Paper text:
We determined IR structures complexed with A62 alone (IR2xA62), and with A62 and insulin (IRA62+Ins), at an average resolution of 4.18 and 4.27/3.95 (global/local resolution) Å, respectively. The structure of the IRA62+Ins complex is asymmetric, with one insulin and one A62 bound at each site of the dimer. While the A62-bound head retains the overall conformation observed in IR2xA62, insulin binding lifts half of the arrowhead comprised of the L1′-CR′-L2′ module, and folds L1′-CR′ + αCT toward FnIII-1, resulting in a T with a tilted head (referred to as tilted T-shaped) conformation. Insulin binds at the site comprised of L1′, αCT, and FnIII-1, which is virtually identical to the single insulin-bound structure. Although single insulin binding rearranges the conformation of the insulin-binding module, A62 binding at the opposite site blocks the additional conformational changes that are required for full phosphorylation of IR. The elongated A62 aptamer fills the space between L1 and the side of FnIII-1’ domains vertically relative to the stalk, and bridges the two domains through its loops. In the L1 site, loops H and L of A62 make contact with L1-β2. This interface is stabilized through extensive hydrophobic interactions, ion pairs, and H bonds between A62 bases and IR residues. Therefore, the A62 bridge seems to trap the intrinsically unstable IR intermediates by mimicking the site-1/site-2′ insulin coordination.
The extracellular α-chain is composed of a leucine-rich repeat (L1), a cysteine-rich region (CR), L2, fibronectin type III (FnIII-1), FnIII-2α, an insert domain (IDα), and the C-terminus of the α-chain (αCT). The β-chain contains extracellular IDβ, FnIII-2β and FnIII-3, transmembrane (TM) helix, intracellular juxtamembrane (JM), tyrosine kinase (TK), and C-terminal domains. IR autophosphorylation on intracellular tyrosine residues stimulates two major signaling pathways: the AKT pathway initiated from insulin receptor substrate 1 (IRS1) and the mitogen-activated protein kinase (MAPK) pathway initiated from SHC-transforming protein 1 (SHC1).
Residue numbers in the entry:
A (entry chain B): 3 to 27
B (entry chain F): 4 to 160, 168 to 591, 686 to 718
C (entry chain A): 1 to 21
D (entry chain E): 1 to 160, 169 to 591
DNA sequence: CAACGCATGAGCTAGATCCG
């Protein structure tokens, strides 16, 4: 749908980042 | 005699009786009532000895000190009785100091019954033979007088007698006048002094026998000092006692076509009698005041009070009952009441045309102006200041003006005004100028762009029904899932259904109240979403309370919240026909606040836990 | 702000690849 | 001992379990503690991880989207108080969207000092109707526990624990399957408690080792000093973060690290009034070397330099950062969504704002009652303005009632133009007295501040009408009130009279709401008094009631109804509600 | 000069200081 907000945002972002890990300062 | 004069209505003073200085036949009704501060020494020098025939009735209701009537009306002969008071033609009720009745000269009261009550000093009531005065004797009412206990010595003079119920009593009005009787060979024309009977046309007394020019009360019709049974052309009958020409009936129609307050009775000519209004299925031609019958729906005609009439509730609308064509302006201000479902369509559901300018000022209870169901035109001869003809303010719940498919409005002049109408959308006041045609004669109207559309939607998409299955008593309804582009915003769905006789039901009709509805509103929670084109995501609802072999109407209406830019969304399905084999307004706002509270927190939580790389 | 550049508009996969190292 | 472990700063744990090992011997976490975003984790390896000596956490605790935590009693068995100096969207404990949480298990938690708790959105969580929250944290209405597995009474809920009677029912309160909570007799409220009911020393919370000993307590209350609990620690020492006391050598050397500003999160801690406070407050400056605070020459304000030109006050996490600053060099929005009541905490932190150099905006705020928490507003300087040349602004505030008490408050806005829209409980009288005392006098729009949509749902009038004569019969009761005339003799549509039944004297006031309902008092219209041209006349108007039941009490009040006008007068008049009984 | 006699009580005739 390419309008990624709501509860799908935390799931769709995981599959594109499945091994690197999330980023923080 | 004298001249004719209209009917009095006097109260609490005595100075109003000077207007009978020259009256002789008072057409109308004379009623003297409620005079309290009058001593008997005020009634000695007062006399109208030439009042001879009154047409409607007489009424004497609580005068004080009227000692006898034999010096006020000493020459009454005939009362006619066209219009009556409780179906009574002579009403003597609750006087005091009334000793003798003393109307010693009346001969033939034509229609009615005499009602004499509760006047505690009245005798000479037992010696009055009402068998030969009024023709219909059995409805008079003479109770609770002085003569329940017989005390007063009513001896009267040498005067003739008859029998009434087995008793051979003498007949007398007063102690010095007795009841004039005529022998039965000449029944109703009345006798002279020695016993010859009068002409065959007269009522009561006649001055000289066998001369119809000079009796004092014509029975059928009066005409120019003679007496005539049917007035020939070129004359016309009027108020069924005297005859006028055409010129004497025309000019007073124009002389009180304008009302002082009311009315006049606008006179028509119809079959040799000037009548106030023609009967049903007949209408006046305005040229020569002739009365001609009808084809189809007849005008009424309903003119109005001083150019503007305001409807506050149903009791204000009762004066406009059955009114078809209205020659002036109109204004509606409805707030509430009880049982507002079908009554506003009942009082004004046959209205045809309106000719001033229409104001929907301060109206709150309405939802739609579809109750002008037969209205075709607002032509607007007179204009509202500001060059307007259509005005609307303070419409907090108005949603739909008119259905431009099953109805064709037009108008010619003036301008329009739609301000502060939130629920009234913008495309529906763009949908009217194709039908009304103010893009023709093209004019710059003044409607603000931001003043409407609030708590409303018009960019709705179209929901398509997916699967339908009918049993003998149940129908399932699953359709395609609608999502706004932010799927947290959709609170749920709203389904509407009602039985339908044919394939002609419109979408918002007949409910038109504050907290009532003709439909049966039912709710359904939304389904879940799994980011999957094929999944178990089609919504559903089961309908149970059906009837066999009925035909219904059904449609789907979403209910979403607002982002903070006044940019709404939504959808609405078509009206589909299927055939078989308390949520108050305060609960709407607080339940929509809690859904916007749960959206706000998990919108904040994503905002601080993900941090971009620099 | 991820909720303002991937909810008020569309965002490309070059943009939300920045969030993961 | 009291706090046997090491002090330990705040941590974030993401994507693995390897970062969790640095919580081995930490005993107090100043700062916050988050556990976030752990997907590749089986439930079998949380059985061998335990943090025994964790005692108190100062700010808050956030757990969001982990996989494999069945119950928290493996990790955090002994946290007794979470204190709440820095909240998180006005919550002090938030557990949001776990998938495998079965039991809450935090069976030793006693006192949440500041904040609230929000346990949200768990598809397996049970035991939420057995906690008795009203004893644990000291407020009770600000919580939010919805959308769970305990939306239905279906989790079993066996417990073998006082079974308290705080509500009207005899229900039992327990943490887990095999741990029941401790509520002992209520003589000492929060001063600690042993097993056999003996009360502890006054300066303690939670458990006790031995009763009445300020040396061997466990969860101490006011400050901390060398294994004891002292109410006010003496001035060889100063307060620090309102839980410690520490000597002179500590509060000085933190200057020497972040005077070389390698990160703008550090603060140069300077001594003031026996506190180790980061920025010395308004009207004070620091000297060169000796690090104290001295009285200022003239005024010297703490200018509160706001980033990016805007701020959006949502809760006490965002309204925490403007504490103690006085001259805002930007503009503030106010957008408080939902909410039960937030006027109790907004005063004590942003209520010292003197000069503001932008615009205000009060949009979509539901639970506002009055704008009084702004205390020392003097001037809205307004070098900038909104779209459409505005300085003040309101929208959709469904419970706003008052701008400021104008008897003792002064406000001078130099330039800009007002704006008001959809305030259903704010009268035009409170915004027109605003119009005369503000610096603007006649700068309006046409269409100006909205004359129609303000105050529709609340009736409000100023001049009073009294009653003069009341007569009573068994079916009719008669009224007579003293007259009233506006400066225009035509500006009167008449009156309107209301009468309703009331069997007791606790009848409400007229809300002013029109919703076609039974509480519209059965309004009877009164014809206007005809123009008498006479002071003493038949224009002392009354009415007569006809449809009465005998021996009952009725509530009557009378209100006028005038045409509103462009001139700023004729607000009307309204009497007070009385009671009359028929015989 | 402060309830009642010179009525009744919401049944085409007025409307509760409505009349002294």
């Amino acid at each position: 749908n390419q309008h990624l907000c709501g509860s799908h945002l935390v799931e769709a972002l995981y599959l594109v980042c499945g091994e690197r890990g999330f980023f923080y300062t | 005699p004298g001249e004719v004069c209209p009917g009095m209505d006097i109260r609490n003073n005595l100075t109003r009786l000077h207007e009978l200085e020259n009256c002789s036949v008072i057409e109308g009704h004379l009623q003297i009532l409620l005079m309290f501060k009058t001593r008997p020494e005020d009634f000695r020098d007062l006399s109208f000895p030439k009042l001879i025939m009154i047409t409607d009735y007489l009424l004497l209701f609580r005068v004080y000190g009227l000692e006898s009537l034999k010096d006020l009306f000493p020459n009454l002969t005939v009362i006619r009785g066209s219009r009556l008071f409780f179906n009574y033609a002579l009403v003597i009720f609750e006087m005091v100091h009334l000793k003798e009745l003393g109307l010693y000269n009346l001969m033939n009261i034509t229609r009615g019954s005499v009602r004499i009550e509760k006047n505690n000093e009245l005798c000479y009531l037992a010696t009055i033979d009402w068998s030969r005065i009024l023709d219909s004797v059995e409805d008079n009412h003479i109770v609770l007088n002085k003569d329940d206990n017989e005390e007063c010595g009513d001896i009267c003079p040498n005067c003739p007698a008859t029998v009434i119920n087995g008793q051979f009593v003498e007949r007398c009005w007063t102690h010095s006048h007795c009841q004039k009787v005529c022998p039965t060979i000449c029944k109703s024309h009345g006798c002279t002094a020695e016993g010859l009977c009068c002409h065959s046309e007269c009522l009561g007394n006649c001055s000289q026998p066998d001369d119809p020019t000079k009796c004092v009360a014509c029975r059928n019709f009066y005409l120019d000092g003679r007496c005539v049974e049917t007035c020939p052309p070129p004359y016309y009958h009027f108020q069924d006692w005297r005859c006028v020409n055409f010129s004497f009936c025309q000019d007073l129609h124009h002389k009180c076509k304008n009302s002082r307050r009311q009315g006049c009775h606008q006179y028509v000519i119809h079959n040799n009698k000037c009548i106030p209004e023609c009967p049903s299925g007949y209408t006046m031609n305005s040229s020569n005041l002739l009365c001609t019958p009808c084809l189809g729906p007849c005008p009424k005609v309903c003119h109005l009070l001083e150019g503007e009439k305001t409807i506050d509730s149903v009791t204000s609308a009762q004066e406009l009952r059955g009114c078809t064509v209205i020659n002036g302006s109109l204004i509606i201000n409805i707030r509430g009441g009880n049982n507002l479902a079908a009554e506003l369509e009942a009082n004004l559901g046959l209205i045809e045309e309106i000719s001033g300018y229409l104001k929907i000022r301060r109206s709150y209870a309405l939802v739609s102006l579809s109750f002008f169901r037969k209205l075709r035109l607002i032509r607007g001869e007179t204009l509202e200041i500001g060059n307007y003809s259509f005005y609307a303010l303070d419409n907090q719940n108005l949603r739909q003006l008119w259905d431009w498919s099953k109805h064709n409005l037009t108008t010619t002049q003036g301008k329009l005004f739609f301000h502060y109408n939130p629920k009234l959308c913008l495309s529906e006041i763009h949908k009217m100028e194709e039908v009304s045609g103010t893009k023709g004669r093209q004019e710059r109207n003044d409607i603000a762009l931001k003043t409407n559309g609030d708590k409303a939607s018009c960019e709705n998409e179209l929901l398509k029904f997916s699967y339908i299955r009918t049993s003998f008593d149940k129908i399932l309804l699953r359709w395609e899932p609608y999502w706004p582009p932010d799927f947290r915003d959709l609170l749920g769905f709203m389904l509407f259904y009602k039985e339908a006789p044919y394939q002609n039901v419109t979408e918002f009709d007949g409910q038109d109240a504050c907290g009532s509805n003709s439909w049966t509103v039912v709710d359904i929670d939304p389904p879940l979403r799994s980011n999957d084109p094929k999944s178990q995501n089609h919504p559903g609802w089961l309908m149970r309370g059906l009837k066999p072999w009925t035909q219904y109407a059904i449609f789907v209406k979403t209910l979403v919240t607002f982002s903070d830019e006044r940019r709404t969304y939504g959808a609405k399905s078509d009206i589909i026909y299927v055939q078989t084999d308390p949520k108050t307004d305060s609960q709407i706002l607080k339940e929509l606040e809690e859904s916007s509270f749960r959206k706000t927190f998990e919108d904040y939580l994503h905002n601080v836990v993900f941090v971009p790389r620099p | 702000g991820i909720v303002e550049q991937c909810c008020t508009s569309i965002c490309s996969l070059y943009q939300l690849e920045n969030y993961c190292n």
